[PDB]
Amino acid sequence: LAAGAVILRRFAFNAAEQLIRDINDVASQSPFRQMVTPGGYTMSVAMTNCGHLGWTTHRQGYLYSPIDPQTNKPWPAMPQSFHNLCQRAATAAGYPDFQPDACLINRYAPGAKLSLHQDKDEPDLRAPIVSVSLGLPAIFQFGGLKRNDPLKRLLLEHGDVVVWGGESRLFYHGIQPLKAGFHPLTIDCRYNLTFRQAG
Numbered sequence: 001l002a003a004g005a006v007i008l009r010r011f012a013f014n015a016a017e018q019l020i021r022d023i024n025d026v027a028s029q030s031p032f033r034q035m036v037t038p039g040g041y042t043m044s045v046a047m048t049n050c051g052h053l054g055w056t057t058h059r060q061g062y063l064y065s066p067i068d069p070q071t072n073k074p075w076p077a078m079p080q081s082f083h084n085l086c087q088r089a090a091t092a093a094g095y096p097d098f099q100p101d102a103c104l105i106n107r108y109a110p111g112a113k114l115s116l117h118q119d120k121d122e123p124d125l126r127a128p129i130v131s132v133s134l135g136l137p138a139i140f141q142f143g144g145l146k147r148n149d150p151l152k153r154l155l156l157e158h159g160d161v162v163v164w165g166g167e168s169r170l171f172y173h174g175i176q177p178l179k180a181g182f183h184p185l186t187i188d189c190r191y192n193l194t195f196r197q198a199g
């Protein structure tokens with residue numbers, strides 16, 4: 001059970017093929033790279049962005065930047081398929097006003113994980129985050145306000161869209177090591193799109 005979170009399973013099933021074609025298109029301008037945390041450690045999850053702003057690691061910490069620090073060019077524009085799905089998802093969740101300007105694209109190879117963290121780099125915490133899962137299934141784990149808070153698990157499969165609004169927006173969360181397997185559309189990985197209001 002989650003407060004403020006609206007889970008729309010298999011919502012992105014029909015849009016899925018075009019989203020993957022558009023992830024590949026975004027990836028040809030801003031390649032997938034495994035970002036280095038401020039402490040000097042490379043993340044197992046490969047990331048890239050699209051939209052006006054993009055989430056990235058820096059020496060001083062985490063920030064949103066209109067420039068890709070690797071290519072030194074701006075991030076690719078948010079694809080229309082991305083805009084359309086997020087809009088329909090947010091409207092179905094009770095957020096018709098949500099206008100994202102950043103989309104963090106995560107690629108999970110077999111065994112890739114994402115340790116517990118909070119999404120607190122956005123200016124307005126009242127605004128939700130629309131998450132779209134594609135490819136192989138992954139176990140999403142969420143806690144509470146603190147670190148040693150009781151963890152709950154959720155499987156996020158292909159096409160699943162979760163809108164993290166209300167209280168769930170500030171919860172500690174992460175992804176457990178991706179189980180090896182096969183998916184017809186992504187072959188051996190999982191993709192996750194997190195639409196954010198970063199400006």
Ligand SMILES: O=C(O)CCC(=O)C(=O)O
Pocket residue numbers: 104106119131133140156173174175192194
């Ligand atoms: O992959 C997921 O479903 C979660 C991604 C996430 O929380 C993030 O990148 O900040």
Ligand SMILES: [Fe+2]
Pocket residue numbers: 117118119173
């Ligand atoms: Fe996150």
